[PDB]
């Protein structure tokens, strides 16, 4: 009498990821049968590649949530807003796929799996290939994951609800960046760190009274009273060397407010700064999900 936790939302150090985010074309009875079916295909992929350590996640935007759950629950869920009156764009979806494991090819099964199983009940508007890069780098040259939430202990904190309707389930952010490596490039190392609040090569902290206010660091780590706003990251890297290329950004977390109040201090909502990497990436894409426990995916009829 407990509720069981998506796969794909705690799962630390994949080297590959599938997102697909999509609209609804007809009727939003479609979305209960291939959800199940698409949950059901995830187990079926574990037990013929158990060494693959496979994980994935179904989540509805807000509209569609509303409709599945009857209004009940999801109480901070809400079509992405425009952060920065536009600086953060807004491209709200009604259905997100999240695949992640240790191999490209059987995440591809299973994004070929995920469009079986809602046909043509959806319309695709974007699919990434994450790939983790050297040294866990994001394609700027600086490491990506050092102050995630570690363990599976400390994760579920974070990213899972814990009691009521909801318990088991999470809330997603995924946002697109687009990396101008060229401009990055005009800029010096030290004025690059900066700009993160890291240093390169090391990864060492940058004290907060020695970096900007205007650094990413200082515009994402914030406190409540010395409380931390914690959110669990599974972003990658994603694109063409000559090509478009850039990070696709996605949390979890047990609640949209740590994850908004990081956006409205990062695009200039907060204090009127924004984040110094607007100098050289930007996001093309934003949207927010309700990712239910498996067990509510069972009750979806
Ligand atoms: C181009 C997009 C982004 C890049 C390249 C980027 C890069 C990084 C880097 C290099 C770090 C430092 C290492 C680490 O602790 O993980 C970091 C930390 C972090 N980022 Fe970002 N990030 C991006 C977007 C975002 C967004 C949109 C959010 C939240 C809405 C976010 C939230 C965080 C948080 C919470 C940390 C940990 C800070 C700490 O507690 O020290 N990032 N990011
Ligand atoms: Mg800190």
């Not at 009156?85 to 494991?101: C, E, N, V």
């Not at 697109?176 to 760190?193: A, G, I, T």
Request: aromatic share 8%; with cysteine; hydrophobic share 40%.
């Amino acid at each position: 009498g407990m509720s069981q936790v998506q796969s794909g939302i705690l799962p630390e150090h994949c080297r590959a990821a599938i997102w697909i985010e999509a609209n609804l074309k007809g009727d939003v009875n479609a979305l209960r049968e291939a959800s199940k079916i698409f949950v059901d295909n995830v187990a079926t992929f574990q037990a013929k590649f158990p060494d693959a350590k496979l994980g994935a996640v179904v989540a509805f935007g807000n509209n569609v949530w509303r409709q599945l759950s009857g209004g009940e629950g999801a109480d901070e869920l809400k079509d992405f807003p425009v952060y920065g009156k536009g600086l953060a764009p807004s491209t709200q979806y009604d259905l997100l796929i999240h695949i992640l494991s240790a191999r490209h090819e059987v995440n591809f099964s299973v994004a070929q799996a995920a469009l079986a199983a809602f046909g043509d009940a959806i319309d695709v508007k974007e699919e990434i290939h994450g790939f983790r890069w050297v040294e866990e780098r994001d394609l700027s040259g600086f490491v990506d994951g050092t102050e995630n939430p570690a363990g599976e202990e400390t994760r579920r904190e974070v990213a899972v609800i814990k009691d009521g309707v909801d318990a088991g389930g999470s809330y997603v952010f995924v946002q697109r960046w687009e990396h101008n490596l060229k401009q990055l490039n005009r800029m010096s190392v030290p004025d690059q760190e900066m700009m993160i609040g890291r240093t390169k090569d090391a990864n060492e902290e940058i004290d907060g009274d020695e970096r900007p206010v205007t650094s990413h660091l200082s515009r994402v780590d914030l406190k409540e009273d010395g409380k931390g706003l914690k959110i669990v990251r599974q972003s990658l890297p994603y694109g063409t060397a000559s090509g478009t290329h850039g990070l696709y950004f996605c949390a979890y977390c047990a609640r949209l407010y740590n994850i908004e109040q990081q956006l409205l201090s990062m695009f200039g909502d907060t204090d009127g700064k924004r984040d110094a990497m607007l100098r050289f990436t930007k996001p093309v894409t934003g949207g927010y999900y309700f990712a239910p426990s498996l067990e509510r995916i069972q009750a979806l009829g």
